[PDB]
Amino acid sequence: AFTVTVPKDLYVVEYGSNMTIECKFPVEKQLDLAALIVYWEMEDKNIIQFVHGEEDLKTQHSSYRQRARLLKDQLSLGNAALQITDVKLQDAGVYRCMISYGGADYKRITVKVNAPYAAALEHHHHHH
Amino acid sequence: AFTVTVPKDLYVVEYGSNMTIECKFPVEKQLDLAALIVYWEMEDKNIIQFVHGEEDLKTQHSSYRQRARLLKDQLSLGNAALQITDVKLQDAGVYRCMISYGGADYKRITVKVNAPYAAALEHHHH
Amino acid sequence: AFTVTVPKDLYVVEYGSNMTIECKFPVEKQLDLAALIVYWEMEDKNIIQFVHGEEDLKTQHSSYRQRARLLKDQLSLGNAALQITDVKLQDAGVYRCMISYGGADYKRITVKVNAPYAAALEHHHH
Amino acid sequence: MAFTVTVPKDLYVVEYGSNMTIECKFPVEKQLDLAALIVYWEMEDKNIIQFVHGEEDLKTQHSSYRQRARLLKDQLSLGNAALQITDVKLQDAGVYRCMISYGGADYKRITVKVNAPYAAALEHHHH
């Protein structure tokens, strides 16, 4: 069966760091971008929609505008990698990588964000 | 772009009743069952996995056993209908219909379950 | 030790209905209103504050205005009864009755609200 | 002068495996009367501490807070209900409530965030 696999289902990241979360899918021979769909989301917020080679920010939340990208290089190697830059406390939660490629599956990834008092205080009072 | 559609994104159902939650997908010529994938879940629990024109029970959460059925006859009209029988308070929450058919999409449906005191008390203690 | 008791820790109420949720506290003979503090809340929202023998609804959450009242006759019988009118889906959740009377204690009460589609839909969008 | 509990910090950030003291202040005029003081500490409706007229009372204490939690009794005479929890775990993260009756009654909320490295986070993730 078409199986999406996650080498890590748990990421522990420092506030302000960069994170690449990886979802693997089978690619035999050459990638057919025309048949590939990748959706990345966290708790029903859309981060990435890559449908036949193009991305649509349509439901792409402002939270992930400027900070989230899919690493396109990795796609031909069967790696749908979400890179988030300048990780914030609001990025903690359960991510889903949803892949359709002649077959469909999704996996969940848990992200925990560690932060110092100063970042935690700002998030606490000014809710990001 | 391939779009899954839900006529109702909210269902309010009575404890003990039967419920059909429906999601639509475009079928603009003879349904190709071989290319259709339908996945139904609620809060990470698998209810239905319809691949290669048949259903796989190897994944059902065991809270949905004998209670969950996908209505196949409708797929040719582009309706992925989940029928749940003997609705329980545990069936309340956010459902997802995930469809792959030359394109892929999903929609969320919220189910609220109304129950009398007697049923609610049992669910409360457990 | 001073013990607050709740005969029912679970209430099931209809949208638009009325509800009286009760917490019991020990009273021997004359209630001393001067020493009695009763605070009722739900998820951090103040519903009722009876201090120095009078209701103090200057801390009441706006969601409970005109809808919430402590039955002051009941206090003399050792019953802190919160009566809520025109129950909304937002009223569902965990209530706490906090009592200070020569001693202090609290208990939790769960309220579930049954509602028709029309009320559920408005709550769903708001 | 309504009886007011005050928290100098409503947010604590603690490292996994460390010890934490979280504090709630209450008005004490002259000398504390232990006989009139009740302090309850709880987190998400689990009881951690019950101090009723001068002693601990395990009337509602949850088993997780067995030999991990104490009230600093010295601090009470200064009007400080200080909860010390030892060997902080990821499950100790959340909203704490200090409930004080001393003539009047009030409660305040304190948020604890627990930072943990991958090894501790992984154990919590599976267990």
Ligand SMILES: COc1nc(OCc2cccc(-c3ccccc3)c2C)ncc1CN1CCCC[C@H]1C(=O)O
């Ligand atoms: C996650 O559970 C499963 N979901 C699905 O379809 C999901 C699905 C169905 C339909 C559409 C999408 C989609 C994909 C990308 C974007 C939007 C939606 C998705 C994502 N098919 C099998 C299983 C389970 N099955 C057996 C156990 C191992 C893995 C898997 C397998 O080998 O296929």
Ligand SMILES: COc1nc(OCc2cccc(-c3ccccc3)c2C)ncc1CN1CCCC[C@H]1C(=O)O
């Ligand atoms: C928490 O809010 C309040 N709680 C209460 O009684 C609680 C209460 C009442 C009765 C008993 C206990 C208790 C104490 C210790 C243990 C168990 C229970 C408790 C804990 N009375 C006023 C306010 C509100 N008050 C006015 C304005 C806002 C804030 C506060 C203030 O400014 O003083």
